[PDB]
């Protein structure tokens, strides 16, 4: 089975160099950039100071415009339905978040020059751009899944010809089976106040990791 595993790697690595012509590869490039600026708060990533974050803000925002172009082409060829309406809803949010990153990063750049770094010595000014970055990524994950559904549902439909639909280059993993019972632990005895369960927010790495090449 050692020889078999090499074929899967070759097919998987074959799409990492598609020059951003596919939607899925662009989203994967997006997520890696965001994790770098997310890890900046803990100070254990490639970024070192505020100026690094500002440079990363332009790169993720510029990649947002190409994502809008890719998504809108599928929507135009898709006939009017529930899937198409959901697809265009997120494309409205991408334009807002991308535009916010461009203007806000410029403002943080000018303030650095005028008052020096001591004005932005605290990391508080950094989370203004980081908050908009993870806001953008949530919409990017949603529009990828919406675009995939419309592609598979209307793969045979007229107008989808000569297009790079995810339905012909990617496959979904079957969702993991739910636990039949939540195992009890001994820590609840120590706590005298029973609280509500924290909502589980999906991680963009895990949301995109379920994609597999044909």
């Amino acid at each position: 089975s050692f020889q078999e595993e090499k074929s899967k790697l070759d097919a998987e690595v074959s799409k990492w160099d598609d020059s951003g012509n596919d939607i899925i590869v662009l989203a994967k490039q997006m997520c890696m950039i965001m994790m770098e600026m997310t890890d900046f708060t803990r100070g254990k990533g490639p970024l070192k100071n505020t100026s690094d974050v500002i440079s990363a803000a332009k790169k993720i925002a510029e990649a947002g415009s190409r994502m809008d172009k890719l998504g809108r082409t599928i929507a135009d060829h898709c006939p009017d339905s529930a899937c198409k309406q959901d697809l265009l809803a997120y494309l409205q949010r991408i334009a807002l978040y991308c535009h916010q990153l461009n203007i806000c990063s410029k403002v943080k750049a000018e303030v650095q020059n005028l008052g020096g770094e001591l004005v932005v010595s605290g990391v508080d000014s950094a989370m203004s751009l980081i908050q908009a970055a993870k806001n953008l990524m949530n919409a990017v994950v949603q529009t990828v899944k919406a675009s995939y559904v419309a592609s598979t549902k209307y793969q045979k439909s007229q107008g989808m010809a000569s297009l790079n639909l995810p339905a012909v280059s990617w496959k979904m993993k079957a969702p993991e089976k739910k636990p039949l019972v939540k195992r009890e632990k001994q820590d609840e005895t120590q706590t005298k106040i029973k609280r509500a369960s924290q909502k589980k927010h999906v991680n963009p790495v895990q949301a995109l990791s379920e994609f597999k090449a044909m």
Partner: protein, 71 residues
């Protein structure tokens, strides 16, 4: 790309400023070239006159602008 972005405008402003800062050097070189020619022609006096006037005004503007960076 989706919307107008300030970075492109900033680049345009910087390029315009550099063009304006090089056109004065070109003007000074032209004045130096027409001044040092011993021969003189009728169609050269007006050009050279306008050239010193423009250069002198530009130098006055530069001198006035420089002082504004001090207190």
């Amino acid at each position: 790309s989706l919307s107008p972005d300030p970075w492109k405008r900033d680049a345009r402003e910087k390029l315009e400023k550099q063009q304006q800062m090089h056109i004065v050097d070109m003007l000074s070189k032209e004045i130096h070239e027409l001044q040092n020619k011993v021969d003189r022609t009728a169609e050269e006096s007006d050009r050279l006159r306008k050239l010193m006037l423009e250069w002198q005004f530009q130098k006055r503007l530069q001198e006035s602008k420089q002082k504004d960076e001090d207190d």
